[PDB]
Amino acid sequence: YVKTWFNQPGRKLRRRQARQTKAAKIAPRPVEAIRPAVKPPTIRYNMKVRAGRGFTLEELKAAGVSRRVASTIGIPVDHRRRNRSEESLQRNVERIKVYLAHLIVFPRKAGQPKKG
Amino acid sequence: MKFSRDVTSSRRKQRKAHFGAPSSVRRVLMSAPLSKELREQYKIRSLPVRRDDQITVIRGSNKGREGKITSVYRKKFLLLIERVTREKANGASAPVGIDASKVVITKLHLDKDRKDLIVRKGGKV
Amino acid sequence: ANPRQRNKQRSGKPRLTRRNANKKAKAKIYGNFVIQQNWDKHATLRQNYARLGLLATPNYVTGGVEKLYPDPTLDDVLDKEISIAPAKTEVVRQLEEEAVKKAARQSNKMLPLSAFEHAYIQRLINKYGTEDFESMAKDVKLNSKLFNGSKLKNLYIRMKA
Amino acid sequence: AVSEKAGHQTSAESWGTGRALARIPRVGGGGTHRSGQAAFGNMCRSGRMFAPTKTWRKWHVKVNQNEKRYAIASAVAASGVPSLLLARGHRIEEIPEVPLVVDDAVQSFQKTKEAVALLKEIKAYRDVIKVANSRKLRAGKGKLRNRRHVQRRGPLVVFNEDTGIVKAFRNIPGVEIVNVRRLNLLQLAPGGHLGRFVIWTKSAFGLLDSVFGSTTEVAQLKKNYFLPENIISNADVTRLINSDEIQSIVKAAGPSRVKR
RNA sequence: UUGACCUCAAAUCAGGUAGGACUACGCGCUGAACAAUAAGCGCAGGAAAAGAAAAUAACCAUGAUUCCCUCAGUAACGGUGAAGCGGGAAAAGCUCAAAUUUGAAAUCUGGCAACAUUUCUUUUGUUGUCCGAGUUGUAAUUUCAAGAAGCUGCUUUGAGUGUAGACGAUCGGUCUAAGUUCCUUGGAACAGGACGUCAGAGAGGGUGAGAACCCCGUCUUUGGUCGAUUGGAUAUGCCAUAUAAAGCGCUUUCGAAGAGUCGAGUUGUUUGCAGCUCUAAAUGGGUGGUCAUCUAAAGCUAAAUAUUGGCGAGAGACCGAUAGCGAACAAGUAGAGUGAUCGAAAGAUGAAAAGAACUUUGAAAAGAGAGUUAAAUAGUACGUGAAAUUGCUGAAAGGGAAGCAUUGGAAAUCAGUCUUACCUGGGUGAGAUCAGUAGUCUCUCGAGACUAUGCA
RNA sequence: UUUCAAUGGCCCGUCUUGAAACACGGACCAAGGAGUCUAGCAUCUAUGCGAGUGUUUGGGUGAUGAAAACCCAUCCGCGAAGUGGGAACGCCCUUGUGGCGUGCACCAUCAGAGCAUAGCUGUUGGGACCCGAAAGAUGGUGAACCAUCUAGUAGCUGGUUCCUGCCGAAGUUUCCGGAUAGCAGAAACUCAGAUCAGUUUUAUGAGUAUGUAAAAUGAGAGUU
RNA sequence: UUGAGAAGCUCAGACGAGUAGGCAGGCGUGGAGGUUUGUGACGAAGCCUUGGGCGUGAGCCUGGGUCGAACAGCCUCUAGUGCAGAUCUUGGUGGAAGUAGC
RNA sequence: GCGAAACCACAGCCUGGGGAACGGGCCAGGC
RNA sequence: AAAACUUUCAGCAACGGAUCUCUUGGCUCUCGCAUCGAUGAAGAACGCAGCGAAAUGCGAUACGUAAUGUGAAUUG
């Protein structure tokens, strides 16, 4: 079998139309969730900083965001990752704190019974 | 140039659509211009032909002839106009088919459906 | 060529033609009305987010960015408090203005007491005063539901207002 | 590409060697004239054509991005030479100037008759009339394949920002409208021939320095791009050969074509 | 005994559900030859599968799955051939078993009766009541990332039902620029020439020959308009079983974690898997380099991915009727074979049938006189009509070959051409690029175009 | 053009064979009918940039087709890791002649050149120039038959399509199917004040010849 | 002296078999980009011809006839691109033959 | 009266010599 | 040696269907979508078209009925 790439420009267009389709549904919030900053796990790459999967629970507790609130305002949680050093904790705590500064959370209507 | 991806410029698909068209489409494919008097009085440029329509032949050997449309032959996309015939071997008169775009409508067989059509297509009466 | 596709070629029945081909046209915006009004339909979502002053991605972009015109320490990270951010556009100000005003409208968080709740807390207060909530919770006769001091404190607070 | 089973749909076997006939397999069965007819071969009727065409032939070809920028720069330079425009088939004999730059108010034309008036005022409509007259029916099987007509190329209008210039010019036969930021070699050297008649707006011409840069200064819109340098500074070889510096040290020329 | 419970049956009892087909892509099982190979068998969906670590690593550590690029034709193995990292696309997390609700089976199906609701009189529910299920365990709560129970004071809250409008999606209607002016050729003008128009429309097709302006359309339309069916929000009225339910915080109190499995021996298939014999543990067990990491033997899950089938669509440096699908047409047809299976050849009169009336010969088929057509050198043996081949006619040649070459003759037949212009007058008038001339226009004084006048 | 006269003229292709003899293929005409596509490798040329180089996995963008063109974030691949002769130049000065210096590349004596693309050629895989050899296996139908794997396997058979021009062998030493070499070309080098020869001599010797060394004749030669 | 498509023009001498093989330049075909302000119902393409011409050749131009709707030169791109053979494939058609014979 | 098929490079007098068969084509003689 | 017969050439008539031109077909690529069946599917058979060459359509309501839309056809 020989795989051909004639749909390469048609996949590019289809993926872009999905981003536009996604943005139409969720109008003002970002098309991606904020990702942490981590360091790759080798002696070849540990100097580089890249994006992680989600923020650790210890990073969210320091930033002031609970693990149940976090998912609702676009902050992924990684229950697996941990902070073995204070630099990873502070690098990503500041990342969450900056995110909260630039964030507008629209209020939600709440059911409110008469008494009690 | 056409910019819609919903319309085909393919000669294969354009010819198949025209020659395989159903009767309710050939009614629109068989349209004729109106005379200048009707065109600037009904505010309509062209209308589909119909029986009892009074037309003038504009092109062909029979150019200049006039008469009512006895019947429209939608199978072959032809009009049959009264007194526009051809003599056969035995002297019987065989009518000659004329394309609907080769005639001009000098008088309209007005009906309520066509009267509604005129006011629909920006016209007046 | 297929017997099924040849069958509808040999038939007189028309195809179930559906004219849906519309490329280069982008999805129309719903959800937020403020974004919809200020969203143009020709520009991309990156161009519209930037024009409206929002961020499409809180991360890096995995490619180039268009250039249309030539350009002319844990204590201080944990105890710090970032001073929010200014609104670069009138749309962002419009979004921010709506959020604060609506939150102010929906701010009545304190709750009243029902007939049972009021009579419950009132009877406890008439015997143990208003400051001794620990002995209020330990009275099995009047505190049948066995509410602790913190629940009884919140009951009294809601009764005050 | 042809079908992946064409010429092999039938069933046949080799009858044998020495039976006074070619040993090509002949279709079995009976009742149909296929009995004894050969297949599975280029020569045999309804047989497999030799080396069936495949879809994974290399259709696209890579060029270094720097060569592409060189070609587009060299094709833009060729569009500022009136002789190269004439030799490519453009009727620019009455154009006031080359390069032909027009005001930015052209960028907001809305009607085609506004565009046609401008082309007639700068005498650029002689090229459009050439394109209209050249429209012929294409020769060959190309016109069975949605290539019905052929014609020449008109002026290439290059703008900076669009305010109706594209819609006001697109229906004029031959005229192609492009943005200065994405210049196309298919449109700057049609057929591979240099010297396209290009009309610029004032804003597009002012943005050419940022698109291409200079031979010493980097382009603003292309990261780390410099215009190519030339193997010769002055390309008038007659000027070097017939110069005072060179003609003063050459030995006395022998005759031209010599006597027998 | 009555009577409960457990069984074992029965009913044309009520309500359901499975089969077969397709199978391009998908997931299992099975399997030869020349490899998870074709076949064979089983089972799905719009995707499937996989999937929230008994995962990598050895780092400053990473963090479900899937796909792409790279790692890499590398390690390893014996030519086969990965994976970790790295770069992208997409991102979403969760549900049980193991706890006493024990101050109250708090849970559920069904019958019946009302009340609603609908893509829908076809759909889907609500409330009430009775019966059954269920304590050999149905709810709430918990899933290790934890959590429970207490305590504390901060922050929280709808599985309700209408109305209105806006924003989207889907289906069906509707709205839409300009020559058929003049001359020539022609059977026909859609050709050529002239003079015009429209152009957000100069795509394509049709019309008696190359049609932007004759017609359908195309552009506007990345929309106005009229309805129909819908989705997520907004605003607002009413209702709200809150004596409730959550997040965070704090501890002189607690914290269950899946077995004929893991694993060991051995035998087969292709390490995994499978059989057989044996058969566990509790900081235990797995996988790695004392240390690190994970937490199996239970379950669910969109997106990125695949797609020779199905419902449509738009295209192409493709083929052009011995090609391209076997099939451009009565094509899986005719036809063949007991059957499995096999399987063709075959497109084009003309603008219009105007498809040859009528007379005549003949038993008839047909023929001849006519007739239609621009054309019958277009007559359905139908566009063009090559070669091989055949008949007739004419000319030439010809003792058992032709045969080709070279050079000429003869005969036939062609190209293959001409004096018509130059020079020098004179006469006559003619007029500009000539005026002992006057104006205008376009370039730049004088350069072109003209106008008036004179023709010395 | 036909025909006559004079002179000449064995049937084409394939294989064979010094050669033919041969044996093959050819009733005739039309149409079809065979070195293709692709992956890797190496040489050479062109093009871009150059201690760098490569945009197209992807993202951005592209209103006039938007599968094009245009733009580039992070990676990654491949690279980086003194004396003589001599090209060229200046200065002379008996000026030419020569000398005095400066000496690239490269060879003798003791101050990175890559990377990408395109084309050419060679080569290895895929069906692999085309037609050719009994099959075997799987699954069916009534030892047989049918369908697929299959374009299975070929060192062998037959065939393999336009023109002109310029070069042009060998058909065999030697070791041993071969690696050499020879023959024939290409490129880069150094040279005509240099060498060379199916050459003839002279003479030294050695035994009419012989080899060697150094005069005539011819040609510019030697290389890698 | 005009003779600079410097890829041109020009002067001189020598030389000419050729298989395998090496090299160079050309002819022709289908389609593509460009061009000829190209040809065509006052006749495109095709075919026919003891018409004429050009080229060493592949081939090309043209008259006449037939015909009826398209087509070509130049630069570049591309490939299912050139036939006398394959006991080649398909189709048509001959001599054997009005024979063998029924 | 109805009517094939095999086969088919082209041919069809000898005599000699022609070295490779050469006679059916070639060379000198008859026909 | 003329005829016949044979051969060659040309004219005309046959034979054949090449070539050319095109073409509601194929082939290839890309894009959108998710929809069979015990409520009887796919397939097969037999019937109905005033005639239809077949082919198509349909099912005893048989080349369809109801409803909606267009608005005057059908056609050999």
From Swiss-Prot, chain A:
Biological role: Component of the ribosome, a large ribonucleoprotein complex responsible for the synthesis of proteins in the cell. The small ribosomal subunit (SSU) binds messenger RNAs (mRNAs) and translates the encoded message by selecting cognate aminoacyl-transfer RNA (tRNA) molecules. The large subunit (LSU) contains the ribosomal catalytic site termed the peptidyl transferase center (PTC), which catalyzes the formation of peptide bonds, thereby polymerizing the amino acids delivered by tRNAs into a polypeptide chain.
Assigned GO CC terms: cytosol; cytosolic large ribosomal subunit; preribosome
Broad class of the protein's primary localization: cytoplasm
Family: Belongs to the eukaryotic ribosomal protein eL13 family.
Localization annotation: Cytoplasm
GO biological process terms on file: cytoplasmic translation
Keywords: Cytoplasm, Phosphoprotein, Ribonucleoprotein, Ribosomal protein
Keyword DNA damage: no
Name this polypeptide is given: Large ribosomal subunit protein eL13
MF-aspect GO terms: RNA binding; structural constituent of ribosome
Oligomer and partners: Component of the large ribosomal subunit (LSU). Mature yeast ribosomes consist of a small (40S) and a large (60S) subunit. The 40S small subunit contains 1 molecule of ribosomal RNA (18S rRNA) and at least 33 different proteins. The large 60S subunit contains 3 rRNA molecules (25S, 5.8S and 5S rRNA) and at least 46 different proteins.
From Swiss-Prot, chain C:
One Pfam family in the UniProt entry: Nop16
Protein origin, superkingdom: Eukaryota
Region (Disordered): 1-23
Function: Involved in the biogenesis of the 60S ribosomal subunit.
Subunit and interaction comment: Component of the pre-66S ribosomal particle.
Listed PANTHER family: HSPC111 PROTEIN-RELATED, NUCLEOLAR PROTEIN 16
Protein name: Nucleolar protein 16
UniProt lineage: Eukaryota, Fungi, Dikarya, Ascomycota, Taphrinomycotina
Curated annotation (Swiss-Prot), chain D:
GO biological process assignments: cytoplasmic translation
GO MF term (any one): structural constituent of ribosome
Annotated compartments: Cytoplasm
Keyword set, alphabetical order: Cytoplasm, Ribonucleoprotein, Ribosomal protein
Disulfide bonds: none
Record bears the keyword Cytoplasm: yes
Keyword Ribosomal protein part of the UniProt annotation: yes
Gene Ontology CC: cytosol; cytosolic large ribosomal subunit; preribosome
Family, similarity comment: Belongs to the universal ribosomal protein uL4 family.
Known partners and oligomeric status: Component of the large ribosomal subunit (LSU). Mature yeast ribosomes consist of a small (40S) and a large (60S) subunit. The 40S small subunit contains 1 molecule of ribosomal RNA (18S rRNA) and at least 33 different proteins. The large 60S subunit contains 3 rRNA molecules (25S, 5.8S and 5S rRNA) and at least 46 different proteins. uL4 is associated with the polypeptide exit tunnel. uL4 interacts with its chaperone ACL4 and the nuclear import receptor KAP104.
Further details from the record: There are 2 genes for uL4 in S.pombe.
Function: Component of the ribosome, a large ribonucleoprotein complex responsible for the synthesis of proteins in the cell. The small ribosomal subunit (SSU) binds messenger RNAs (mRNAs) and translates the encoded message by selecting cognate aminoacyl-transfer RNA (tRNA) molecules. The large subunit (LSU) contains the ribosomal catalytic site termed the peptidyl transferase center (PTC), which catalyzes the formation of peptide bonds, thereby polymerizing the amino acids delivered by tRNAs into a polypeptide chain.
Description of its domains: The eukaryote-specific C-terminal extension harbors a nuclear import signal and delivers the ACL4-uL4/RPL4 complex to the pre-ribosome, triggering uL4 release from ACL4 and incorporation into the 60S ribosomal subunit.
Listed name of the protein: Large ribosomal subunit protein uL4B
Species, as recorded: Schizosaccharomyces pombe (strain 972 / ATCC 24843)
Gene it is expressed from: rpl401
